[PDB]
Tab-separated table of C-alpha atoms in Angstrom:
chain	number	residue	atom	x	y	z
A	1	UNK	CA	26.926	24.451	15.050
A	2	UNK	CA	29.244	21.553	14.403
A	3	UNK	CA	28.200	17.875	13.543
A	4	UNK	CA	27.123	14.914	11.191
A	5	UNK	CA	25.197	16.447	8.399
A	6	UNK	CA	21.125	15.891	9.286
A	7	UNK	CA	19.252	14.836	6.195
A	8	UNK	CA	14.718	15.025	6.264
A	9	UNK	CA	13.391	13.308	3.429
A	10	UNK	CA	9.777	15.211	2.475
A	11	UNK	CA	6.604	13.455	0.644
A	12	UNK	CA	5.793	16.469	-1.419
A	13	UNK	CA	2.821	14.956	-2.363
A	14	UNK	CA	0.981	15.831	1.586
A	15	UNK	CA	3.876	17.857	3.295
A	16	UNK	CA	5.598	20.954	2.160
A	17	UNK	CA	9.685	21.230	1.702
A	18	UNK	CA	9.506	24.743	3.520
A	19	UNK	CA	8.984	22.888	6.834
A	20	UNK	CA	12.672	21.589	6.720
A	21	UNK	CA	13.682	25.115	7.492
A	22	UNK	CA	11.398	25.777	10.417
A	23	UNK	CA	13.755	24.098	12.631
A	24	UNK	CA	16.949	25.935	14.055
A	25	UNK	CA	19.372	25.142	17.283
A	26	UNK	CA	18.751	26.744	20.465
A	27	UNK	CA	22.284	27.284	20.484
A	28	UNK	CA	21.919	30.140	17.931
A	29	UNK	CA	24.111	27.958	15.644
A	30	UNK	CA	21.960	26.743	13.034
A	31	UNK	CA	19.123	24.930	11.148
A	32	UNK	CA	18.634	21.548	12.626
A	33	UNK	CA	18.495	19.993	8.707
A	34	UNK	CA	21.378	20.072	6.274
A	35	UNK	CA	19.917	18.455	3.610
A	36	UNK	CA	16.408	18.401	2.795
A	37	UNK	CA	15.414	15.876	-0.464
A	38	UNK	CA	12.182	15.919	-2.554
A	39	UNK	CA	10.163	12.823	-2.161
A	40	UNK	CA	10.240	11.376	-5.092
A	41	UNK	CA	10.540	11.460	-9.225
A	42	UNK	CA	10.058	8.306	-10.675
A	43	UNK	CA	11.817	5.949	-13.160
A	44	UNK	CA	8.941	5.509	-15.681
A	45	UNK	CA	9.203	2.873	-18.681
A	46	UNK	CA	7.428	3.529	-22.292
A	47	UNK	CA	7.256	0.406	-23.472
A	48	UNK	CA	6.701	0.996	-27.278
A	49	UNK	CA	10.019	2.782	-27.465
A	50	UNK	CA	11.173	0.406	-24.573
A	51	UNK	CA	12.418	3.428	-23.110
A	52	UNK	CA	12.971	4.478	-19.494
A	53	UNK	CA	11.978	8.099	-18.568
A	54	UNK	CA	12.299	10.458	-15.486
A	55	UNK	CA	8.423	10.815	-14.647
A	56	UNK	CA	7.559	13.412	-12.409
A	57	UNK	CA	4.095	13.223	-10.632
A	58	UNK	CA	1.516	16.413	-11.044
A	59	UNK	CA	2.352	17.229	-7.615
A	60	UNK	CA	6.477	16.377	-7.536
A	61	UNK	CA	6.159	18.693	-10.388
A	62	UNK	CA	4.105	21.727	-9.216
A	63	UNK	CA	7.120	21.409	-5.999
A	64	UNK	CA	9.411	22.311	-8.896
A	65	UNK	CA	7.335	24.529	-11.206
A	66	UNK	CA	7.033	26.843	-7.977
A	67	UNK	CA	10.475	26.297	-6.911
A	68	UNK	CA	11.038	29.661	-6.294
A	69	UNK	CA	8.553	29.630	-3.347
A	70	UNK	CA	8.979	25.759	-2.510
A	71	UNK	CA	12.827	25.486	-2.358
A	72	UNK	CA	14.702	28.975	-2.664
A	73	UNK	CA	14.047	29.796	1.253
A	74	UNK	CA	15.780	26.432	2.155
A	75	UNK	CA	18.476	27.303	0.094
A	76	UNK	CA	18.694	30.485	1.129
A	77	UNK	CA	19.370	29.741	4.116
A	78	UNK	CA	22.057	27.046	3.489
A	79	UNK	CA	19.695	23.889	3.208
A	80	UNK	CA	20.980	22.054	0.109
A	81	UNK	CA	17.654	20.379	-1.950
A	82	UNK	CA	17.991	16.874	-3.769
A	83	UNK	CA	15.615	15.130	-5.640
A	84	UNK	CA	15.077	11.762	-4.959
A	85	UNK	CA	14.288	8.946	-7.735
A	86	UNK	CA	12.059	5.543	-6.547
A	87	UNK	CA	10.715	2.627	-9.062
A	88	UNK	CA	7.499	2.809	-10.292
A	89	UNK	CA	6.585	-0.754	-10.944
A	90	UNK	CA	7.291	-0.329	-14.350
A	91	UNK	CA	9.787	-2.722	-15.010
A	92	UNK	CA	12.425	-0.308	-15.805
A	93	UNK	CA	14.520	0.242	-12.640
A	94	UNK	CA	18.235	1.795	-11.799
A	95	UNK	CA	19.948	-1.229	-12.482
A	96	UNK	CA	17.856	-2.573	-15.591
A	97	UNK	CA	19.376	-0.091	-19.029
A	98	UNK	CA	20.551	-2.473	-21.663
A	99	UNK	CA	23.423	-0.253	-22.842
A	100	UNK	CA	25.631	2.604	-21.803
A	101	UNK	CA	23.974	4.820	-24.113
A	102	UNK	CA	20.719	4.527	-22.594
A	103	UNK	CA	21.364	4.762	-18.972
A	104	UNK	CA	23.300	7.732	-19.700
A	105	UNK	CA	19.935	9.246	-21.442
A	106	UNK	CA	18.252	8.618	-18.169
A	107	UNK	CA	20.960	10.389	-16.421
A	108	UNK	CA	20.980	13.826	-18.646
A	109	UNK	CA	17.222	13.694	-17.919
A	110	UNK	CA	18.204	13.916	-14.322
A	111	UNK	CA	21.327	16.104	-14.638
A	112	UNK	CA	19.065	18.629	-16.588
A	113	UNK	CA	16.272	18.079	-13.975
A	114	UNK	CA	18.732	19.614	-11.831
A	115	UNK	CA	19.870	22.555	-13.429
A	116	UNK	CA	16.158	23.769	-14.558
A	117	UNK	CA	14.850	23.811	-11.223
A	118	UNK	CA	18.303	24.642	-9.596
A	119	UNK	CA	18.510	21.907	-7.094
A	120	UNK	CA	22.104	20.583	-5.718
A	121	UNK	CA	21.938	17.125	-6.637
A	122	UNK	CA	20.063	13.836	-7.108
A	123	UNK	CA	19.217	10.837	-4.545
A	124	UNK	CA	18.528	7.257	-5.755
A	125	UNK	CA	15.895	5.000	-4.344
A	126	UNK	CA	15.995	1.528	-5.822
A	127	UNK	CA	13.126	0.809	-4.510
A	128	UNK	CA	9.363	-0.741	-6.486
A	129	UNK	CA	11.013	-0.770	-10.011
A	130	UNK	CA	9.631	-4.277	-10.265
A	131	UNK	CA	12.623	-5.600	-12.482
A	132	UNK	CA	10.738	-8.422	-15.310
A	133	UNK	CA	7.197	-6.197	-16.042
A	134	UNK	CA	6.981	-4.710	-19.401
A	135	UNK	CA	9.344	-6.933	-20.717
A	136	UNK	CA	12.149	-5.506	-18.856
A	137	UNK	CA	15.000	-7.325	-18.030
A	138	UNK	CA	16.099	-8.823	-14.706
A	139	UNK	CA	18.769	-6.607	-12.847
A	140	UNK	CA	22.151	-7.030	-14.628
A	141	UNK	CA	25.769	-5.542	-13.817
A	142	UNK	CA	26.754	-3.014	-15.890
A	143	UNK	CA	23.679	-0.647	-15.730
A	144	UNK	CA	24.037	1.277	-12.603
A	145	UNK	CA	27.620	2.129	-13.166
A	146	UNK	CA	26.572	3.560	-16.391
A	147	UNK	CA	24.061	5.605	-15.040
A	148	UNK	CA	26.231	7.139	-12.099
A	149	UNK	CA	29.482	7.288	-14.007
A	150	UNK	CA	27.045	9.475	-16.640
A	151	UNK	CA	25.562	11.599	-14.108
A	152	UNK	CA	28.676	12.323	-12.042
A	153	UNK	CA	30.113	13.246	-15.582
A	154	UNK	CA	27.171	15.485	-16.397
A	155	UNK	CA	26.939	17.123	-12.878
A	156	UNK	CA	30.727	17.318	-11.064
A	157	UNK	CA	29.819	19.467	-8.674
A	158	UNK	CA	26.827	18.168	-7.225
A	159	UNK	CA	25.104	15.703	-4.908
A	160	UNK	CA	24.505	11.998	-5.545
A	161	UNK	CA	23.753	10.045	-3.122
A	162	UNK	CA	21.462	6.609	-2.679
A	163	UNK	CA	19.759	4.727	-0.260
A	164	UNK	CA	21.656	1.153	0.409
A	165	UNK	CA	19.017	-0.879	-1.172
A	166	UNK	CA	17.699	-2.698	-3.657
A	167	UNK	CA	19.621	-4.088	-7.074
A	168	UNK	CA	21.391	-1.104	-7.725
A	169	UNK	CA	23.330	-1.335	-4.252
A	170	UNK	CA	25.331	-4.888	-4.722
A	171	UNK	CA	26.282	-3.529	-8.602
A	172	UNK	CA	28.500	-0.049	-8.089
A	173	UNK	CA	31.546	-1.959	-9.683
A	174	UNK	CA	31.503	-2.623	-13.867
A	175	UNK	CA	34.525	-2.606	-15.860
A	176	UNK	CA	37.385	-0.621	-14.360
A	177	UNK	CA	34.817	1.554	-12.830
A	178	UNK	CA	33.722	1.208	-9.330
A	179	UNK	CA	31.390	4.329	-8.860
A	180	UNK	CA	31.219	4.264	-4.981
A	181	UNK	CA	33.833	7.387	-5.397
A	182	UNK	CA	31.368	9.250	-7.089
A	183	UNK	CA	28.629	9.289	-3.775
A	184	UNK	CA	28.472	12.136	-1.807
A	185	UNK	CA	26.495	10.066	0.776
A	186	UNK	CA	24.963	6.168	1.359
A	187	UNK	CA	22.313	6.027	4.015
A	188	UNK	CA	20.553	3.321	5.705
A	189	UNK	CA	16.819	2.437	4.334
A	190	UNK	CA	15.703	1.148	7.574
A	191	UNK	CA	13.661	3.836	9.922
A	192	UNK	CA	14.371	2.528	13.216
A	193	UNK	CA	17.544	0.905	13.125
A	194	UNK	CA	21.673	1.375	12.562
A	195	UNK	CA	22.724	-0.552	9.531
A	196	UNK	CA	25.750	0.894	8.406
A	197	UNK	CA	26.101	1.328	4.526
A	198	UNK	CA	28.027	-1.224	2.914
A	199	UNK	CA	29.863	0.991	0.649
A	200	UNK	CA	33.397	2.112	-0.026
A	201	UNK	CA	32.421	5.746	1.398
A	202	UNK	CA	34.212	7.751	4.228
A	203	UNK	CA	32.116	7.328	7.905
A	204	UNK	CA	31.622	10.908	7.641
A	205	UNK	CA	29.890	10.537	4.346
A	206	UNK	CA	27.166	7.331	5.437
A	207	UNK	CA	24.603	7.474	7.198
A	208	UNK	CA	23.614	4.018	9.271
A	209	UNK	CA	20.849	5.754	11.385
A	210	UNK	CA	17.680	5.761	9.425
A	211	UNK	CA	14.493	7.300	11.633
A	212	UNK	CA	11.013	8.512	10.590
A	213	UNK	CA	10.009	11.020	12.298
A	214	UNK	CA	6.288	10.751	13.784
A	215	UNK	CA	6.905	6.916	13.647
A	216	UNK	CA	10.091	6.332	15.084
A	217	UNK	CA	10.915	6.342	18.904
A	218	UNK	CA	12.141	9.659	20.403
A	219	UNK	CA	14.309	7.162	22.458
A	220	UNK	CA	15.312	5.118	19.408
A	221	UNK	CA	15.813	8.683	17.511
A	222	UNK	CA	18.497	9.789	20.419
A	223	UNK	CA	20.112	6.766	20.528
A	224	UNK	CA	20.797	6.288	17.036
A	225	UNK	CA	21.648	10.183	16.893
A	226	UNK	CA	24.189	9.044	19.891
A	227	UNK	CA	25.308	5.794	18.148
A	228	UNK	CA	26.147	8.037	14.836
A	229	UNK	CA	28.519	10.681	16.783
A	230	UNK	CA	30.059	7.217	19.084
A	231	UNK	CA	30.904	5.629	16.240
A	232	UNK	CA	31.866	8.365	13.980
A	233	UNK	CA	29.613	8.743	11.303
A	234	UNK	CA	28.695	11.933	9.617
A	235	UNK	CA	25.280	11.772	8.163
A	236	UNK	CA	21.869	11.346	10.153
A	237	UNK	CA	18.816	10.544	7.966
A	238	UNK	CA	15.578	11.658	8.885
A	239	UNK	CA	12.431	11.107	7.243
A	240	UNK	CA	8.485	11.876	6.660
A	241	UNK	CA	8.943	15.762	8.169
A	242	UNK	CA	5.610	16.776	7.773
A	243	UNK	CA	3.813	19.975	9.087
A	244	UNK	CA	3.137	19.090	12.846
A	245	UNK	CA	4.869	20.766	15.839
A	246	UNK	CA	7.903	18.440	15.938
A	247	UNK	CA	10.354	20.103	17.931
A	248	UNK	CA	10.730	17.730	20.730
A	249	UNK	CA	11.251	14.573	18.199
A	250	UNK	CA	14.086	16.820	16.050
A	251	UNK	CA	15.843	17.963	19.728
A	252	UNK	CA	15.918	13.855	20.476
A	253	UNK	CA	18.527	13.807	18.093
A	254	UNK	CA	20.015	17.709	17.522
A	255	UNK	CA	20.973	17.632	21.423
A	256	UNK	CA	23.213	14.129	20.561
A	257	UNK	CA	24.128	15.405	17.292
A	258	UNK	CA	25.375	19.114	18.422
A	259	UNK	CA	25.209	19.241	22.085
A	260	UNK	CA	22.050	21.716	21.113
A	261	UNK	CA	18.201	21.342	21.239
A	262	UNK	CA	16.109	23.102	18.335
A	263	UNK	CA	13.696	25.485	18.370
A	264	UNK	CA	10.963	25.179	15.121
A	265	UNK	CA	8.806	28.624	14.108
């Protein structure tokens, strides 16, 4: 099929990943997801060490322990798997490391994340860090770039992509680095509405259509599908996929998206 790349966020924690892959075009010419991301790793803080960690929740991690099961059949048939980060109201957040040095620690936690469970890339979600607990510091300028400029460095050829929100967001320039390059994809936080990105990335790599499925509008979820192809963007985000017949809210936007309705297993 041919079209901006669909994206279905999953909560791993009560739906499984393998549903991303139940849903195909009628047209014969595809899955209706492009991208499916793992809902969500965390960015921890151990405040002894006063030292942010990627935390994994018992259930993020058996996703990934069983990856094999959970995440090869997307793959193998072309799905590409990120795993997302959120805040953990822990103080420590994206746009909160106090040096170089230790945002890029943070980042070879993720880059290695990666390449253990053999996913294509990483998603950030500035999102509940709670910025001040734990005596953490307030958001300042110079962390995030770290931290991307690291993980781009550690993983050139995969995905990194965030969500336009939160701290992290208004600081991707430090230095003589501005690290918007280094995105594969921006995408609007918003289910429910067009808010296009505002981020130094090609309209073919943002996504200002944000819908959840099961929650969102199968109206709202055409139009914005329509509004993304009108205005030429090339990313659709979809989120909260679960395990329900879904078919009809997925067509709403694969018919604007490829000219095709989908058909799920």
């Amino acid at each position: 099929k041919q079209g901006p790349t669909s994206v279905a966020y999953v909560e791993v924690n009560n739906n499984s990943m393998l549903n991303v892959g139940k849903y195909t075009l009628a047209d014969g010419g595809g899955n209706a997801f492009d991208v499916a991301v793992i809902f969500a790793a965390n960015i921890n803080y151990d405040t002894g060490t006063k030292t942010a960690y990627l935390h994994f929740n018992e259930n993020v991690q058996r996703v990934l322990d069983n990856a094999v099961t959970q995440i090869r059949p997307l793959q193998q048939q072309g799905i590409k798997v990120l795993l997302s980060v959120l805040g953990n109201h822990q103080g420590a957040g994206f746009a909160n490391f106090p040096s170089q040095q230790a945002a890029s620690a943070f980042a070879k936690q993720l880059s290695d994340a990666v390449a253990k469970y053999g996913l294509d890339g990483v998603d950030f979600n500035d999102q509940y860090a709670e910025y001040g607990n734990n005596g953490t510091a307030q958001p300042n300028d110079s962390s995030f770039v770290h931290l991307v400029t690291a993980l781009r460095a550690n993983m050139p050829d995969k995905i990194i992509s965030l969500y336009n929100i939160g701290p992290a967001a208004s600081r991707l320039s430090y230095g003589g680095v501005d690290v918007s390059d280094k995105f594969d994809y921006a995408w609007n936080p918003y289910y429910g509405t067009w808010q296009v990105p505002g981020i130094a990335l090609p309209k073919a790599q943002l996504s200002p259509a944000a819908v959840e499925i099961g929650r969102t509008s199968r109206s709202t979820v055409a139009d914005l599908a329509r509004r993304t192809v009108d205005e030429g963007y090339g990313v659709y985000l979809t989120y909260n996929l679960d395990g329900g017949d879904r078919t009809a809210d997925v067509s709403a936007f694969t018919r604007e998206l490829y000219g095709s309705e989908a058909v799920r297993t």
